[PDB]
Design a protein around this ligand. Structure first.
Ligand code: ZN
Lengths: 208, 55, 138, 100, 124, 150
RNA sequence: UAGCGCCGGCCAACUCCGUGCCAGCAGCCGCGGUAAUACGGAGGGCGCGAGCGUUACCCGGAUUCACUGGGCGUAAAGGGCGUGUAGGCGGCCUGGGGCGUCCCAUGUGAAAGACCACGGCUCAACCGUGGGGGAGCGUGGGAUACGCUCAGGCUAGACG
RNA sequence: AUGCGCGCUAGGUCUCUGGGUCUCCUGGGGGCCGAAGCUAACGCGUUAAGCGCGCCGCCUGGGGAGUACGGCCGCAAGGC
């Protein structure tokens, strides 16, 4: 049971532009370029110095809201990453990036993750020529993600993938727009992502 | 008090010590006499003359 | 009564070093000589020497200190910051090869009485033996 | 292999039977100190050839009686009376520990 | 102490004391009221706290607290007793669950309804 | 050039001829996230003056922290008064595991991976002093080998 | 289909109305006796979300039974003082025995569970295959610095 | 309000009592002031509450309570 409801309020509360809407949050309408203060009655009052707990919680909430996954799933992913080899932050971000709907968004089939989730759930996305319809499917480096043959004529798909011409996708990915398909080359690195999150705060939060 | 201040401010200390002094707190010690005008006269005179000809 | 000679020697060294004495004397034995040797190579003490005091054989230890420091409390830094006794009469500590401790991430040493003589942790690990854990120094 | 234990003889007041006090040493589970403990076994000697203060070896065997499951293997040392004395005095000190 | 003193004697383990003896290691108990009364706080506080003297399905007769704006507990009402001590009244260490057996939910609550068990009001 | 973190302010009182007179004490940490930290304690009749004074003292009283991979060379235990601090190096990807006071001190020195524990008394002032002492008592391989070998 | 708990500090999240030491809240410190961010309601807000809270019990925090890792002049804590049994502990040098101790090899340490690597259920939970680890015991062989034992000495403890 | 034994860690001063090569030096007691160090602080500091080793005793928030019951001892008060 994902979070369904007003979105740019999260943009405001976090105080940073989380691209959770698509085209609107690019135009002068993101409701962050106008009224960048937090929501509610006491939005535009002078803010007290936040505690350490406030800081850690806010960072974690921001990171969790970027991907739009449940707290339970987030915690489980963090536990999984904490138990593996290498840097916890890097591995955690990589595992967060291995979701099917996230890859769908990255490849550009969808405009937003909230849309990529709907595309995957409604069986419009195939992996290795086999229909996969769960947003949490972890894709491994070296899998082919394509659009289902029955769902090619969808004007949503056509319009979305027309905008990908002369546009650069992530260096850890490859895209064939003519074939309407993509390849997941490798796990993304810390620097390959432009996330406005310092994951050290997230680690510190979850340790306690 | 002066010695303590100089120690605190990393200022080198030169002292004409005697038997009842602490050798550790002095950077450059001249083990001699603190009384006997004659001793003070000799030591200070030599030091001042050396400063004079050094300039 | 003198129940522990090795602890006594370590305490003598510590007490001497805390007041910046250049040399200390300890009643002599082979085992103490081995401890002093191990300490000598690692460059903790300046060096040991066998002497005789009223016919009784003693070991004289020449100690080592850092350079004179600047500012308040000009006393020089120590080379032996900390020294302890691990295995004491009434509680002996014996460790296998796997359980040999690491001291200050390799900065400090631990002395083992292995079946192949008195060694450091590094030497013991190389030789793949354990034994009685005498002391740790750093 | 059949267990072999070594101890002093502390009682020969029975027919074809000796009492052997076996000593054991082991580190404490928690504190690591070397603990020393003792146990008594009734050993079988059909020839009556062992007396007080003989450090002897006992070996595991088929039951002979209710409390006898060990035989006497061989003799190690004789005349070691001090251990018997120590055991006796330890056992004797109990009359001092009474309440009534 | 010495290692010898620890071998000989060891360390005593600390055991807890149950703050709710009357329950006998159960989340709740079922009881019957005998007295429904009001009592006064300890000192710094002042009120008339409602209190019920319950007899449990255990072998215990204990006082319990009735939380909320009002109650309906008579002299023979079947009630459910829950853990929890009241700081003011010196001796009561149990609460009553509101809205189980005979105790009813506090009418016209809107904020914390799970506590003080009241059904969600109809909005139309 | 430096960052300031305010550990605490406390209002203390002294009794005059039938009356209370107040003073304010501030504990300020100053750092550059590069291995230089100072700690200051400032008392003044008013809070801003206390904070200014603490900042001044902190800038006047600095220590160098020998970092590598953003961690400590070796574990250290330091007891100041009745309070004790334990610091241990951690592999990268751990984060700063500490209470408010040690965390604030260690972050401003640039430490990114460390394990800490406070023992005995947990007065923030004493804990802060103990932390600074431990940071002052850190040696590297080079320093130790220079002392021992020459 | 969208609920539930919180918004004085701990602990993320604040204004108005109602009441006025009442009614009530409470896990601790504590709120309420007229402008209550702590009670009841509303609007906002925060945290989780087919779940959300409470009660009971266990580990943690508790280094608050302290082996790792505590203490006793005044905070709780040196026996009123001797003599002394069991026990615990014990100087220097040389040799024998290998008991403790250390090491190598080997037999166990069932499966399942835990760890790692691959896989099968569209993912996961779940499950399959493979590999390793493992405290502790038994057997064979080895070392002798330390503790033990047995001999031979020494005078720095002790006693004449 | 400081268990016993042993070893090590600057000194200055007063005093009781032995020895010597008697200005002084070397033992054993009793007191003050103080290095390093220790302590929450007061203070301790070669007569340690410093640094160490061995053995014993004891502590685990206040009150209820040295009370209750039980056991041992006492003529009893009472004691453990
Ligand atoms: Zn927006």
């Amino acid at each position: 049971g994902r979070y369904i409801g007003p979105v740019c309020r999260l943009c405001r509360r976090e105080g940073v532009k989380l691209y959770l809407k698509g085209e609107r949050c690019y135009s002068p309408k993101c409701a962050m370029e106008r009224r960048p203060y937090p929501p509610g009655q006491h939005g535009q009052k002078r803010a007290r110095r936040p505690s350490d707990y406030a800081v850690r919680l806010r960072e974690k909430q921001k990171l969790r809201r970027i991907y739009g996954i449940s707290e339970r799933q987030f915690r489980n992913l963090f536990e999984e990453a904490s138990k593996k080899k290498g840097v916890t932050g890097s591995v955690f971000l990589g595992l967060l990036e291995s979701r099917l709907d996230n890859v769908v968004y990255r490849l550009g089939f969808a405009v937003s993750r909230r849309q990529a989730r709907q595309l995957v759930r409604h069986g419009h996305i195939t992996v290795n020529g086999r229909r996969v319809d769960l947003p949490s499917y972890r894709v491994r480096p070296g899998d082919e993600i394509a659009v289902a043959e029955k769902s090619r004529n969808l004007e949503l798909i056509r319009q979305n993938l027309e905008a990908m011409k002369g546009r650069k996708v992530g260096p850890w990915l490859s895209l064939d727009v003519e074939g309407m398909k993509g390849k997941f080359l490798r796990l993304p690195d810390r620097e390959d992502l432009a996330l406005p999150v310092n994951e050290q705060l997230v680690i510190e939060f979850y340790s306690r | 008090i002066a010695v303590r201040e100089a120690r605190k401010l990393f200022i080198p200390v030169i002292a004409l010590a005697d038997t009842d002094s602490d050798p550790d707190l002095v950077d450059y010690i001249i083990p001699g006499n603190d009384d006997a005008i004659r001793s003070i006269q000799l030591i200070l005179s030599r030091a001042v003359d050396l400063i004079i000809q050094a300039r | 009564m003198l129940t522990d000679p090795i602890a006594d020697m370590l305490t003598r060294i510590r007490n001497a070093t805390r007041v910046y004495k250049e040399s200390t004397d300890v009643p002599a034995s082979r085992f103490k000589e081995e401890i002093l040797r191990i300490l000598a190579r690692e460059g903790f003490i300046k060096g040991y020497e066998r002497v005789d005091v009223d016919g009784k054989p003693y070991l004289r230890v020449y100690l080592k200190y850092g350079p004179r420091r600047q500012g308040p409390d000009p006393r020089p830094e120590q080379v032996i910051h900390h020294i302890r006794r691990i295995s004491k009469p009434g509680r002996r500590v014996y460790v296998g090869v796997k359980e040999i401790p690491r001291v200050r991430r390799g900065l400090g040493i631990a002395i083992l009485s292995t079946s192949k003589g008195v060694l450091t942790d590094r030497e013991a690990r190389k030789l793949g033996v354990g034994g009685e854990l005498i002391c740790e120094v750093w | 292999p059949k267990k072999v234990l070594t101890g002093v003889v502390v009682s020969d007041k029975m027919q074809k039977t000796v009492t052997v006090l076996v000593e054991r040493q082991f580190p404490h589970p928690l504190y690591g100190k070397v603990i020393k403990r003792s146990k008594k076994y009734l050993a079988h000697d059909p020839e009556e050839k062992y007396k007080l203060g003989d450090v002897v070896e006992i070996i595991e065997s088929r039951p002979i009686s209710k409390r006898k499951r060990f035989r006497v293997l061989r003799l190690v040392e004789s005349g070691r009376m001090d251990l018997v004395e120590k055991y006796l005095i330890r056992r004797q000190n109990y009359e001092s520990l009474s309440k009534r | 102490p010495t290692i010898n003193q620890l071998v000989r004697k060891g360390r005593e383990k600390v055991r807890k004391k149950s703050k709710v003896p009357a329950l006998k290691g159960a989340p709740f108990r079922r009881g019957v009221c005998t007295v429904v009364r009001t009592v006064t706080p300890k000192k710094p506080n002042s009120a008339l706290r409602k209190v019920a003297k319950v007899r449990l399905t255990s072998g215990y007769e204990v006082t319990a607290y009735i939380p909320g704006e009002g109650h309906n507990l008579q002299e023979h009402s079947v009630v459910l007793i829950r853990g929890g001590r009241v700081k003011d009244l010196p001796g009561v260490r149990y609460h009553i669950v509101r809205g189980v057996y005979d105790a009813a939910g506090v009418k016209d609550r809107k904020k914390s309804r799970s506590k003080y068990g009241t059904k969600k009001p109809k909005e139309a | 050039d430096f960052e300031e973190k305010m550990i605490l302010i406390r209002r203390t009182a002294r009794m005059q001829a039938g009356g209370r007179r107040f003073r304010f004490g501030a504990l300020v940490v100053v750092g550059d996230r590069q291995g230089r930290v100072g700690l200051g304690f400032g008392k003044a009749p008013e809070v801003p003056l206390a904070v200014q004074k603490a900042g001044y003292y902190a800038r006047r009283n600095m220590v160098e922290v020998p970092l590598q991979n953003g961690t400590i060379p070796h574990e250290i235990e330091v007891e100041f008064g009745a309070s004790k601090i334990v610091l241990k190096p951690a592999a990268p990807g751990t984060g700063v595991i500490a209470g408010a006071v040690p965390r604030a001190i260690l972050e401003l020195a640039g430490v990114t991976d460390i394990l800490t524990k406070e023992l005995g008394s947990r007065n923030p002032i004493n804990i802060a002093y103990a932390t600074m002492e431990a940071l002052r008592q850190l040696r590297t391989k080079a320093d130790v080998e220079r002392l021992r070998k020459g």
